[PDB]
Amino acid sequence: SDLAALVSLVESVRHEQQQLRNLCEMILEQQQRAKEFGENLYFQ
Amino acid sequence: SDLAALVSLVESVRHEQQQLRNLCEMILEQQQRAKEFGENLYFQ
Amino acid sequence: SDLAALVSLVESVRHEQQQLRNLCEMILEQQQRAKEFGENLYFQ
Amino acid sequence: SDLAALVSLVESVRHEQQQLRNLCEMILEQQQRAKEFGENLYFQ
Ligand code: NA
């Protein structure tokens, strides 16, 4: 009951952490595209 | 009592995680503006 | 005893999350400097 | 039993947080390389 409510709360933390992970994967991908763009302008 | 204190601690973790999420959203937005700036200099 | 060990574990999660927060603040600051550098080359 | 299952869940959260930390270290490193590239084009 109190244990169950705490388990649910930790599951919410876990879910919100995955949303943050997915955001950070988007950050990595977008910065890589920007980096490759700059490199394409210099090397080609 | 011990359960209540642990619940409060997990709520603090959850709050701090949202502060981190909001920071990472700012990172994404700022890098997108920088990326679009570079693209504006090349495509226009 | 089991409760105490779980509290310690959650405190470790909280600490590691702050280390991650401090890293993400460094990411924001460094990207801002890079963005401002590019802008300095164009606007001045 | 319920305590054990909760401990396992928190350990999963901790592991997933380290995966996120490692991703964010890669973000920092890649952006630093991009920043240094731009600086190399201007200062040399
Ligand atoms: Na977290």
Numbering used by the authors:
A (entry chain A), B (entry chain A), C (entry chain A), D (entry chain A): 195 to 229, 991 to 999
Direct quotes from the study:
Centrioles are complex microtubule (MT) based structures that are required for the formation of centrosomes and cilia/flagella. The protein kinase recruits STIL/Ana2/SAS-5 and Sas-6 to a single site on the side of the mother centriole where they assemble with CPAP/Sas-4 into a cartwheel structure that helps to establish the ninefold symmetry of the centriole. Here we show that Ana2/STIL proteins also homo-oligomerise and that mutations that perturb the homo-oligomerisation of fly Ana2 in vitro also strongly perturb centriole assembly in vivo. Thus, Sas-6 homo-oligomerisation alone appears unable to drive efficient cartwheel assembly in vivo if Ana2 is unable to homo-oligomerise.
The purified Ana2 CCCD protein readily formed protein crystals that diffracted extremely well, enabling us to refine a structure to 0.80 Å resolution. The structure demonstrated that the Ana2 CCCD forms a parallel, symmetrical 4-helix bundle, with a left-handed supercoil. Analysis using the PISA server showed that residues located at the g, a, d and e positions of the helical heptad repeat were all buried at the tetramer interface (yellow residues). We replaced all ten residues at the d and g positions of the CCCD with either Ala (CCCD-A), Ser (CCCD-S) or Asp (CCCD-D) (residues circled in red). A SEC-MALS analysis revealed that all of these mutant CCCD proteins behaved as monomers rather than tetramers in vitro.
